[PDB]
């Protein structure tokens, strides 16, 4: 069971947004597909849901007049499209499959009139300076993007352990910036390889770094 | 409907059972449902129907209430379930959601690993310097980190940013980057970041020369 769902986008205030789930793994005509929205402050709020089956939908009041929530069967997919944004829109969106098993890994939106950019990203390289003990730390600097969020992974997800990737800050010039770091044995920096693998949905933008030792 | 959690946010050791409350305006007989949520993470699904628990989770947590009143447990907690809970009704619509418990684990002091790293050339030739300071798995939350330029203490140039409570060891990492101009930069020699924290008996600094 699985729910993939569209990308984080920035859309500018006035606009509309159309977030997709792409179900698999089970019986799509046969479960509730339900939005829920979670906003800063505002909490988890249920925007309304579907039946693929005949298509019989329901929306939060509060959220009738600007979302329609369709699916399409022949391609196990749900749809919810959002008019007339607003800032108070920005928020991660969850589809979720019927309470709620399942729930899809959020589409961040944030409404803004700025423009997407992607990242830059640097080695944090290690030396001498980032070592302690019999361990040394590395990492990857992703610096100067809009809007959240980055996404990075290490080796194509196989080093995990020790990996801390940190919230974001906010620059004085508006732009976002965080750290992915890992601590790993010393004594193996000669031989071991470690790439941040960096993803920017809402540009797109995709890049591998190798991160190699500094003396 | 409204539905009310409390405690906003606990403090508990591993090991200590966990109380969590969930009030609903109405009577919503056991259509009662309880999420756990961790940062950057979708919720997942613990206990529906006030008391059923989802296949998977441990048998460590319970629901139990009826009509109002609905009370999560935790009867041994475990480092893991460090995260948001919520409740949620599902009695007709709109479907409610508690505003969240946070459960926090208290353990004992650990202090910093400390580790600096010098800007990378690539971002030198973009004109800015980048310094960061790392922090690693240390507890409690609480941590004090000074830069000094040529022995300077700066203010005014630097950012932090804490990681969320770690699930496996309940530990915090934390990062102080200070950002500076390539002309600045080159206009001092050493860069040093000092650590200050419960389980250091003396501050640890970690400095470099630009050369």
């Known amino acids: 069971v699985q729910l993939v769902q569209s990308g984080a986008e920035v859309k500018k205030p006035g606009a509309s947004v159309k977030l997709s789930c792409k179900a698999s793994g089970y019986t799509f005509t046969v479960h509730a597909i339900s939005w829920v929205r979670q906003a800063p402050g505002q909490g988890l709020d249920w925007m309304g849901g579907i039946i693929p089956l005949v298509g019989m939908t329901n929306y939060a009041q509060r959220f009738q007049g600007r979302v329609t929530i369709t699916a399409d069967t022949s391609t196990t997919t749900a749809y919810m499209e959002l008019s007339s944004l607003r800032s108070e829109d920005t928020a991660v969106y969850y589809c979720?499959?019927?309470?709620?098993?399942?729930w899809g890994p959020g589409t961040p939106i944030t409404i803004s009139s700025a423009s997407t950019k992607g990242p830059s990203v640097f080695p944090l390289a290690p030396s001498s300076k980032s070592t302690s003990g019999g361990t040394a730390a590395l990492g990857c600097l992703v610096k100067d993007y809009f809007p959240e969020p980055v996404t990075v992974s290490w080796n194509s997800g196989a080093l995990t352990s020790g990996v801390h990737t940190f919230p974001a800050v906010l620059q004085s010039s508006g732009l976002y910036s965080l750290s992915s770091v890992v601590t790993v044995p010393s004594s193996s920096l000669g031989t071991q390889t470690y790439i941040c693998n960096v993803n920017h949905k809402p540009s797109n933008t995709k890049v591998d770094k190798k991160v190699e030792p500094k003396s | 409907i409204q539905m009310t959690q409390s405690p906003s946010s606990l403090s508990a050791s591993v090991g200590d059972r966990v109380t969590i409350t969930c009030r609903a305006s109405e009577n919503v007989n056991n259509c009662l449902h309880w999420y756990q949520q961790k940062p950057g993470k979708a919720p997942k699904l613990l206990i529906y129907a006030a008391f059923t628990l989802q296949n998977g989770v441990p048998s460590r947590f319970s629901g139990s209430g009826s009509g109002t009143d609905f009370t999560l447990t935790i009867t041994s907690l475990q480092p893991e379930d460090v995260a948001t809970y919520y409740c949620?009704?599902?009695?007709?619509?709109?479907?409610?959601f508690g505003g969240g418990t946070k459960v926090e684990i208290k353990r004992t002091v650990a202090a910093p690993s400390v580790f600096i790293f010098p800007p990378s050339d690539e971002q030198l030739k973009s004109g800015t310097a980048s310094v960061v300071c790392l922090l690693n798995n240390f507890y409690p939350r609480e941590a004090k980190v000074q830069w000094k330029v040529d022995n300077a203490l700066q203010s005014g140039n630097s950012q932090e940013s804490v990681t969320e409570q770690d699930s496996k060891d309940s530990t915090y990492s934390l990062s102080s980057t200070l950002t500076l101009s390539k002309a600045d930069y080159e206009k001092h020699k050493v860069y040093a970041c000092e650590v200050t924290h419960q389980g250091l008996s003396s501050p640890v600094t970690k400095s470099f020369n630009r050369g």
């Open positions: 979720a499959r019927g309470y709620l098993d399942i």
């Open positions: 949620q009704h599902s009695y007709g619509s709109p479907l409610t």
